Each structure stands twice: as C-alpha cells, then as structure tokens.
Structure 1
Amino acid sequence: CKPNFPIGQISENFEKSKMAKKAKLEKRRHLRELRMRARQTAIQLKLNPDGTMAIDEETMVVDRHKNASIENEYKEKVDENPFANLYNYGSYGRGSYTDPWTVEEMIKFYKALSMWGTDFNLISQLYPYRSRKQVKAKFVNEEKKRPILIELALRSKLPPNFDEYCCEIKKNIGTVADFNEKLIELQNEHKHHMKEIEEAKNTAKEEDQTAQRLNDAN
C-alpha cells in the first residue's frame, strides 16, 4: 500500500478540494498564451418658456460613481472558493518564469556577443519583450554550461563572418532618422519654448508692477 494516493475511505468534503486543483491547472495554461501571442461632462442648461437661459442645478454637481458603476456591472462574476486563495512562500515576491531559449535565438545571441565585448544595454531591445535582468543571467549560466563556446568569442577581435550586414541594418530600419542630430534639433525647440514662456514671465511681471503703482498713487 504505497504512501502516494490510495482512495480508501470516507474522505468527507473533498469535492471542493477537487475542482480547485483542476482550476489551478487551467489558470496557468492561460498564462502560457499571453506569452505565445506576445512573441509574434460639462455643465448643461436649457431654455424654459418661463425662465429662459436657466442652468440645471443637478448638472452643476457630478456624482463620480455612475461612470464607475457602468464598467463594474460589466465585469465577470465568480464565486470564491476559500480553498482557491492558498498562498505559500512563493507569493508576493518579484520574479517570474523565464521563457526558455531557442537555438534560433542563439545566432542572434552569439553574434551580438561576437560584435561587442559584453554590452547588455542594446541587446535587450533585440529580444523585444525580454528584460535587462534575466538576459544578464543568461550570460552567467552559460559560463558553466558552455565555457568553451564562449571562449571563442573574445579571441575573435575582428569583423566576423560577413553576415551581420542585414542585422546591422535590421536594427537601423526601425524609425529611420539621423539620431545623432535628431535629438539636437528638437532639444533646441524645447529651450525656445522655455525662453518664450520666460519672455511671457517677465512681461507679465512688468505690467503688474506698473498697474498697482497706479493704485498706490490713487
């Protein structure tokens, strides 16, 4: 009589335990498909015959809840099973599940590690929905996994096998603009608006002292 799972006596109130387990397996599988798809109110008046051009006293104030209650009515209703809320040490702590890496990604990983030394800033956006933290750990775990395949990369101090010319420009064809001077030209616009509001600042200041000096005379 092995110690794992005999069905063997009364076992009162196990059904609420049963479909909770079948729902938690269903919940995690819908978290998989978010990943697979991502890889890819003024005031109102009226015109009475008695008093024309009269404004409504109820539109003067706002309720601040009728707008909220519309969407809250159109939310999904579910019945809470107090078994479903279970929590462990793995709760309310940052960190998630990393989507494991493929060999199609490695040719964009080795070559991006072949061109530069080790630069985690620009390779992050190359893997568009991966973040800066776990890709740094992908450099670390490969030191124990493939120590010799990495050791060919820093010996390579030359332009590599000339196939990165597409991936040189595939990075560049996103938002084609001369970024070495695109940032300069609109920054000069920004200080122009700040200078104009600074002109608006002092010209508001000088007329104000001019006006109340006349009130000081009278």
Structure 2
Amino acid sequence: CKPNFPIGQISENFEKSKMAKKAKLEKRRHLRELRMRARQTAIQLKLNPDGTMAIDEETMVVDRHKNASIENEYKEKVDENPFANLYNYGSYGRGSYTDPWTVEEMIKFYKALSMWGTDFNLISQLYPYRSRKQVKAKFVNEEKKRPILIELALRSKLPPNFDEYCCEIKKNIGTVADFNEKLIELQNEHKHHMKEIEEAKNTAKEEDQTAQRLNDAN
C-alpha cells in the first residue's frame, strides 16, 4: 500500500476536484494550439409636419453603455468552481516556456554567428516571433553543452562556404527599399509638413495682433 494514490475510503465530494483537474488538461493544451498556428453616432434630426426641421430630445446625448452592452453579450458564460482559480508561487510573474530549438534553426543560427561576431539585434527578427532575451539565454546555453562550436564560430573569420548570398537577400527581400535614404526622404517630408505648421501658426499670430489693436482704438 504505497504512499502514491491508494483508493481507500468514503471520499465524498470529489467530483468537482476531479473534473477541474481534468479541465486544466485543455487549458494547457490550447496554448499548444495557438503556438503551432503562430509559426505558419452623430446628432440626428427629423421632419415633423407640425415643427419642420426640429431637433430630437434623446439623441442630443449618448448613453455610452448600449455599445458596451452588446459587446458583453457574445461572451462565454462560465460557472466558477473554487478549485479553478488556484494560485501558486508560479503565478502573476514573468516569463513563459520557449519552444525547444530545432535543427532547422541551427543552420540559420550558427551561420549568422559565423558571419557576424555576436549580433542579437538582427537575429531577433530572423526568428520572427522570438525575442531578444532567450536567444541570449541560448547563447550562454551553447557555451556549456557544446564548448567547441563557439570556438569554431570565433576561429572562422573569412567568407564561409558561399551559399549565404541568398540568405544575404532572404533578409533583404522583405520590403525592398533603399532604407539608407528612403528613411531620409519621408523624414524630409516630416519636417516639410512642420514647416507648413509654423507658417499656418505665425500667420495666425499676426491676425491676433491686428484685431486686438482695432478694438483698442474703437
């Protein structure tokens, strides 16, 4: 009769303890559903025969709750069992579980670590929905387990096997534009629009000076 799970007597009111444990199986499971698919009201009026072109009393003001009411109505209605909202030390905290890395992504990583020295800025976009923090945690990870390939990444300071020319442009095909000076020309447009604004502002400053002098003499 081990200390792990003997069924041994009356055990009253465990049907909600059982099913909420069974219901947590799917709450963790549909997190795995979403990860794999991630990879891939003016004023109104009226025509009254008595009073033509009359304004109505009710639409003068807005309720601000009826548009919130319909938003609430197509929401899920759940009956709370006190065992669902269980909290532990791992609650209301940072972080998540990173997807364990693949051999497909290794050849996208070590070649990026062979060409560049260690440049986490552009690796972060290469892995489209991965973040800056855990690729740095992978960098410290691969020192400990494979201590010899980070040496080979350091030692190779030359053009590698020249297959990366597509991988040069595989990064450069997303939104093809000369960013070295296309960033300049719309920034020039940004200050051009501002150069309108002071002209629209300072001519509005001088119209104040002519009117406030006119009623002084009046």
**Shorter-chain TM-score tier:** over 0.9
Give the secondary-structure state (helix, strand or coil) at the position aligned to 2:78: coil
Alpha-carbon distance, 1:33 to partner: 1.1
Structure 2 unaligned segments of length 5 or more: list them: none
- For 2:71 and 2:191, how far apart are their aligned partners in 1? 43
- For 2:86 and 2:76, how far apart are their aligned partners in 1? 21
Alpha-carbon distance, 1:89 to partner: 0.4
Quote the residue 1:203 is aligned against.
203
- For 1:33 and 1:198, how far apart are their aligned partners in 2? 54
Alpha-carbon distance, 1:65 to partner: 0.5
Does residue 84 (structure 1) correspond to residue 84 (structure 2)? The answer is yes
Deviation per residue, 1:94-136 (Å, 9 max, x gap): 1001000000000000000011000000000000000001111
| Runs of at least 4 residues off by over 4 Å | none
Larger RCO of the pair (alpha carbons < 8 Å, separation 6+): 1
- For 1:150 and 1:25, how far apart are their aligned partners in 2? 40
- For 2:63 and 2:188, how far apart are their aligned partners in 1? 45
- For 1:37 and 1:69, how far apart are their aligned partners in 2? 32
- For 2:81 and 2:134, how far apart are their aligned partners in 1? 35
Deviation per residue, 1:169-200 (Å, 9 max, x gap): 01000000000010000000111111110111
- The size of the alignment, in residue pairs, is 218
Give the secondary-structure state (helix, strand or coil) at the position aligned to 1:153: helix
- For 1:57 and 1:208, how far apart are their aligned partners in 2? 38
Give the secondary-structure state (helix, strand or coil) at the position aligned to 2:80: coil
Quote the residue 1:31 is aligned against.
31
Give the secondary-structure state (helix, strand or coil) at the position aligned to 2:153: coil
Give the secondary-structure state (helix, strand or coil) at the position aligned to 1:147: coil
Tell me the TM-score normalized by structure 1: 0.99
Structure 1 unaligned segments of length 5 or more: list them: none
- For 2:81 and 2:207, how far apart are their aligned partners in 1? 70
Alpha-carbon distance, 1:81 to partner: 0.6
Alpha-carbon distance, 1:57 to partner: 1.1
Give the secondary-structure state (helix, strand or coil) at the position aligned to 2:120: coil
Does residue 163 (structure 1) correspond to residue 173 (structure 2)? The answer is no
Alpha-carbon distance, 1:12 to partner: 1.5
Alpha-carbon distance, 1:71 to partner: 1.5
Alpha-carbon distance, 1:75 to partner: 0.6
Tell me the TM-score normalized by structure 2: 0.99
Alpha-carbon distance, 1:77 to partner: 0.7
Alpha-carbon distance, 1:209 to partner: 0.7
Quote the residue 1:180 is aligned against.
180
Give the secondary-structure state (helix, strand or coil) at the position aligned to 1:24: helix
Deviation per residue, 1:35-60 (Å, 9 max, x gap): 00001100000010000000111001
- For 2:58 and 2:150, how far apart are their aligned partners in 1? 72
Alpha-carbon distance, 1:26 to partner: 1.0
Give the secondary-structure state (helix, strand or coil) at the position aligned to 1:62: coil
Deviation per residue, 1:59-96 (Å, 9 max, x gap): 01100010011010111111011111000000000100
- For 1:167 and 1:74, how far apart are their aligned partners in 2? 47
